Amino acid sequence: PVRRLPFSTVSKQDLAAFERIVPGGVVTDPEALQAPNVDWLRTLRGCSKVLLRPRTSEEVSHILRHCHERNLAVNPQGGNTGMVGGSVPVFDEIILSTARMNRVLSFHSVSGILVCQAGCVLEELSRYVEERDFIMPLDLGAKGSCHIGGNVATNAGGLRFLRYGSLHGTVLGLEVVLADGTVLDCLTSLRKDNTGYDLKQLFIGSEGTLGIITTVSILCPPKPRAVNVAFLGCPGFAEVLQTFSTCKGMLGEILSAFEFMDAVCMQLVGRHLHLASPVQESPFYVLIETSGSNAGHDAEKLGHFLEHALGSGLVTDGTMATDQRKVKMLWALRERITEALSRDGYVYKYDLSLPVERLYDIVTDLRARLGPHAKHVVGYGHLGDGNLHLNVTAEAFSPSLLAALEPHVYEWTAGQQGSVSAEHGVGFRKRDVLGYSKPPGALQLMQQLKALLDPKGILNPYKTLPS
């Protein structure tokens, strides 16, 4: 298995130092510590004996200063919604939670620049800015629990990535605490600033291996005056792809989301979540969202788009909604897919970037490769961004079924020059499969960067670079 690196252990003196550093922010009770040690998928559990919950950036700096001198490994944790085992300890690394770093520092109603602490939950940030007629540039099904610091640390994609793009573009500045406790202030709240290297980009997608994000500056797009969502049934994946091409051609700049899900996904969300399908039974379903400034113009685009899609046979049945209650219910069919799979049994999860034309080929293949040993096999995700979420469910974990999935799925993906982790990141699960998507020379530079910023390696060990 994996072996524990020669870190120190948490002593009584360390617990006393943490109570001094974070008064009332030291949890050592083993039953309370059980939940933060187990990941969201509940397939990994650490043996951490202390979870620290600082309130301020200075406290985070001082904690790591103490941990750097004492050589104690630290596992930063936000909402603990990560999918790659990066959010929980492997052995006894101190859990540093951002749960109390949940304050908004400022929001400028003209520029739409938000400055807030890393532990602010994304949905509450969305409600804050939408009260001021702006929106967050990303949204995910984990919005209710995931923290913005975790989102930046994982470079979270999400459901509006098609419209607003990466956090690499939307993060304007970061405050980061490094492994030795130096608070690196790169918290520029400016749209444009070319005064040296864009150091904050290193920490976007680094997953707490190069430093702990404590404050985030984010560009909030304006809240759209008109939001429409269309939910369509397609008779095949070829029609889904041409529907997407027609979608870009006819809706254009107002398109804010394009998601797909197969029939089995719809069945699972119907079975486990009791959500009736709003369309005719189809092999594939598509969720399109539009955001724009003129409701009348957006209605014309979508109407003419829909007229052509049904007329040319790309869509068999579809429905549309503008009412906020109904719009959210259609989104629920997509956002809650992840919940229904993990409740269906053991989930074999694969998050792949592939050529959009070949996005679903692996799902048909794995249904053929995997006999009755797979309970269900589903494919869905962000088709507009080339993102497939490949999931296999079974009654329980099987080494035989794992051997059929791996390395086959990773070799398939590499054959398409694709990404084995499009969005969710590397963490513990995918640390040894980066060669499928990254060349050795790139991986070495990541290691040299790690040694520069965290030479003792106390920040998220066993993560997220190869051994």
Ligand X SMILES: Cc1cc2nc3c(=O)[nH]c(=O)nc-3n(C[C@H](O)[C@H](O)[C@H](O)COP(=O)(O)OP(=O)(O)OC[C@H]3O[C@@H](n4cnc5c(N)ncnc54)[C@H](O)[C@@H]3O)c2cc1C
Q: Which residues participate in the annotated binding site for (R)-2-hydroxyglutarate?
A: 334, 338, 349, 391, 424
Q: What is the CA radius of gyration of the chain?
A: 23
Angle at 454 between CA 452 and CA 458, to 5 degrees: 165
170 touches a copy of itself (CB under 8 A): yes
Residue 71 CA to residue 6 CA, distance in Å, equals: 9
77 touches ligand X (CB under 6 A): yes
Residue 151 CA to residue 454 CA, distance in Å, equals: 21
> Footprint of ligand X on residues 382-401 (CB under 6 A)?
none
154 touches ligand X (CB under 6 A): yes
> Footprint of a copy of itself on residues 222-261 (CB under 8 A)?
222, 224-225, 245, 248-254
User: Residue 167: in which H helix or E strand, if any?
Assistant: helix 167-170
81 touches a copy of itself (CB under 8 A): no
At 188, list the tokens: 């520029």
**Binding-residue pattern over the window 187 to 226 for ligand X, x denoting contact by CB under 6 A:** --------------------xx---xx-------------
Find the DSSP H helices in 11-56. Answer: 12-21, 30-37
Name which of ligand X, ligand S2G, a copy of itself, none residue 391 binds, using a CB cut-off of 5 to 8 Å depending on partner kind. ligand S2G
Q: Please identify which residue in 170, 282, 316, 338 interacts with ligand S2G, judged by CB under 6 A.
A: 338
Find the DSSP H helices in 102-166. Answer: 122-131, 148-154, 161-164
301 touches ligand S2G (CB under 6 A): no
Q: Which residues participate in the annotated binding site?
A: 334, 338, 349, 382, 389, 391, 423-424
Does residue 214 have a cis peptide bond before it, meaning omega lies within 30 degrees of 0?
A: no
CB 74 within 8 A of CB 459: yes
**Binding-residue pattern over the window 330 to 369 for a copy of itself, x denoting contact by CB under 8 A:** -----------------------x-xxx------------
Q: Please identify which residue in 8, 102, 182, 319 interacts with a copy of itself, judged by CB under 8 A.
A: 182
324 touches a copy of itself (CB under 8 A): no
Q: Which residues participate in the annotated binding site for (R)-malate?
A: 334, 338, 349, 424
Residue labelled with tokens 């995918």: 430
Selection from 149, 143, 146, 142 nearest residue 214 by Cα: 149
Residue 148 CA to residue 189 CA, distance in Å, equals: 16
In the complex with ligand X, which residue's Cβ is closer, 44 or 250? 44
Identify any residues that bridge with 389 across adjacent strands, giving them in sequence order.
351, 380
Binding footprint of ligand X on the chain (CB under 6 A): 40, 75-83, 86-87, 98, 118, 140-142, 146-147, 149-151, 153-154, 156-159, 207-208, 212-213, 338-339, 423-424, 427, 460
